[PDB]
Symmetry: D2
Subunit: 299 residues, 4 copies
């Protein structure tokens, strides 16, 4: 039948099971509900989507922990967002987010973020706003790491054009890992639907990204060394991520990934709404921070 034709990019946060890998620390709750310093891990990637201008977001978690994500985040209305929830019964891979979120996505552009990925740096807002406005094809970010063999790895020719993607290569072609933030057009769900599980039994995001690469529709932007991309893969790196955020925040007196703040700066909530969000947290440093935001100009 006939369709008609007349900002809308939707977001997805994958906040499912980290299996048994960080057990026993994660036996009683999801990794993405563990705090990084002063706030739940999931505030960080949520803030990343918000900085990209995305207000309609699906959170994918396990059946066991969806209610706790719901208690924490609600339907998003407090922060000028709309948050929806979906469950992932079995951790069958990151590309399953698109099958799980098919109805949520509809006919729109989308972005996927890993619920345990934290980014920090300058003009991040601008770096994200950019990729979001590129409507067709896919956009990813490559970042120089010490251990590229743990990641999807991008190979570049001498001109600096991406020419290949390999998932966890034993002999990486570069030290450039693909980060856990992905922007996609309307082709992604069909590409995902045609994926066959890898030898590990999982539906691989690198296969989605390779599909765009083969079509000549993959933009790979370098996220330079002056950005911090932390993930919380080990107990040791989770501790480092906490110390990192604590050092920045205690130095600056400004928070990284405060959603109330980001919504306020985006004009998604007003001063009066922000004041209401501060009232219940007024006795701790978090509510006090929100209060101070109403009476200060921050450039």
């Amino acid at each position: 039948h006939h369709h008609h034709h007349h900002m809308k990019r939707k977001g997805i946060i994958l906040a499912g099971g980290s299996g048994t890998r960080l057990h026993p620390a994660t036996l009683a709750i999801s990794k993405q509900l563990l705090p990084v310093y002063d706030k739940p891990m999931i505030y960080y990637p949520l803030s990343t989507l918000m900085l990209a201008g995305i207000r309609e977001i699906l959170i994918i978690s396990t059946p066991q922990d969806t209610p706790r994500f719901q208690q924490l985040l609600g339907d998003g209305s407090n922060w000028g967002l709309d948050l929806q929830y979906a469950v992932q019964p079995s951790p069958d891979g990151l590309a399953q987010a698109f099958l799980i979120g098919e109805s949520f996505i509809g006919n729109d552009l989308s972005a996927l973020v890993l619920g345990d990925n934290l980014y920090y740096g300058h003009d991040f807002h601008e770096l994200l706003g950019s990729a979001s406005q590129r409507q067709t094809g896919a956009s990813v970010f490559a970042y120089h790491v010490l251990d590229p063999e743990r990641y999807g790895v991008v190979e570049f020719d001498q001109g600096g054009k991406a020419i290949s993607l390999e998932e966890k290569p034993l002999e990486p072609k570069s030290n450039y890992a693909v980060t856990g933030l992905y922007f996609y057009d309307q082709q992604v769900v069909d590409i995902a639907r045609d994926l066959k599980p890898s030898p590990r039994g999982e539906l691989e995001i690198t296969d989605v990204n390779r599909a765009y690469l083969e079509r000549g529709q993959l933009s790979v932007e370098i996220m330079g060394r002056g950005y911090a991309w932390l993930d919380t893969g080990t107990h040791d790196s989770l501790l480092e991520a906490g110390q990192f955020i604590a050092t920045l925040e205690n130095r600056q007196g400004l928070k990284v990934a405060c959603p109330e703040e980001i919504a306020y700066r985006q004009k998604w909530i007003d001063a009066a709404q922000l004041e209401k969000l501060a009232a219940p947290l007024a006795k701790n440093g978090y509510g006090q921070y929100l209060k101070r935001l109403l009476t200060e100009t921050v450039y």
Copy 2:
């Protein structure tokens, strides 16, 4: 007589929100294990195997999920709820039937202890069949705690809960040993000016009869609580620095049960199987074949 143990793992209010909005503090990790493994380990090192875990209505089921009935670790665990955070002394009313006619010990669910001959420092408090024993520890900010005053001869003469003008820098730690008198003392407590049933009031009751032993926990011991986001990060880094230097874990309950002969080599072997692919299971398997002094 036998001594039963109680871990109070109740609500920290809104103090660490939003980090703790979703889940209680004592279910969160300190480095590589849930915070509550640490006080549980403290009780186990005092030789206590019958333990009641008290937490909020919402999270008691989740402590139950995490720890089970304890039989996998040669423990006997029971659970109870504290409907509202109305004071630490409520532990003895909530746990009155659990305690029965036995000796007891209470540990706070967010207290972490590290040091040498702990097994021995606890055993000597555990051995007193009469009176109460507590530990005093020199801190920078005594006003946050129950504060003990000593006379010139080193005798404890007063306790004040969160004084505006502390008499010393010696705070009472969150580990308490009691005789058969504590339930009856807790039953006669009146709420304090802050609307709480105070553990310090209990301790003062023993002090007034000359039945409070106040042992000094020396500077060569580490007492950490997880009261702020900053100190929480400090506790994790501390445990990480010790464990990665030594190749030995602090407060691994499976290891402690095994060393106490509460489980045998074959039970530990079974416990190691689920986490065989990660560091924790690998650690437990290694405990089967290594002599550690």
Copy 3:
């Protein structure tokens, strides 16, 4: 007499005494020779000047420690720089750098950096290159901090124009501290010469900066929250600075403030020279890093 008229901006690092403040840790050596993680503190501000394109640099230290700075840094030729040395017998204030360095500066533009100031962030190269190219007036950077009362503080009108500078105000007009990096034109030495000591007995850089402000020649650029400006004011912040750098470097496998690297990327030294600098450090991670730089493209 008649003068004639036909990149040349010179740099100065103040690396003098921190008094007794960090004693006893600084009894046996200068604070600016203490390592921050894996390299001496002074590598960081030196790298900052290098990133600004400055190759001619004066290091001001105490008589006691100048030889150790000389042993460490030499005359700069190894790194495509020229380094000169001057002593500050008594810690009489930061603005004394211009009287001490008067002959070094000559008729040129200049930049002053504090030897204990560390900066990290994206397009820092570009942010510095910018200020260096502004030839007339002065350029400074303002950064939101938790404790502005410890610093020179800048006040802005509602339009965002700087209107006042106050040195360590008990009641700061904003949370914007002036950072320890300063770019000056040819007027600075005369302004410094006319300074009278403050009540603390010191020649204040904020008085120099106010002089430019009163003339309408002070540019104050915001260094945003996605940049890290760390100083090493306390034992606690020195520890945090070390952990910060260690987390970035171990994540990325790239160093912050490696002068050999920066000189190589600036074309001030070639591959063969870099190879020679790596030979003596070949057994440790530092020399190994320098070696890897010859065989890798880093964007």
Copy 4:
């Protein structure tokens, strides 16, 4: 008999360059004090007051500048040089005349110890008038150290220096107590395959005569060395976490001398005056008026 002490604070080569290019590692800070305060404090806690400090030619004058003749702290300090890093056992040749006919103890200038009843753990090694005493400690990477093998009954039967295939995870720490035999044993040592005079060879010489006491330093003690940039940062954070929690310092030599009665309240008062405006002087002044148990 009296026991003299030696701190070996010599060169770490190019291993931590460029951090240590300008100055030796043991002059750098661990948190708030120079690294060498920590082993000095260890000797002082073992009751040792006559101490020889051995370092590189370049930096001995700077240890002399930092520490003086020790009389301000009720110590008797002397200095000597190790012209080249030719093995720890060189300490006893360099210090032969210093030692004379007395008992001795050697500590490495970059070893940091923390734990309870250290004063007591050292005093019991200090009391042996015959033989040698060392401490073994469970580590993750024993191949970096002198490694001790035990039989089934817990007896030390072998030592290997940096084995490719360690017999256990028990490393010998950098603190050694010796009787009058050590100089003569060191004098007969031959350089090892690595061109070093080995402390492990000295220790094996005592072991062969059944005169090596190998005490276990338990897991409740922290032994830190500052061998890598990473571990250096871990040592500082560890000391910071303890000191800021307790309001008490680890390895403050002025305090240790005062508690040992080597200086009096009036001497400490004078020592506090120079740094009165910072935390360290404020700490020392506070020690005059506070009972710390």
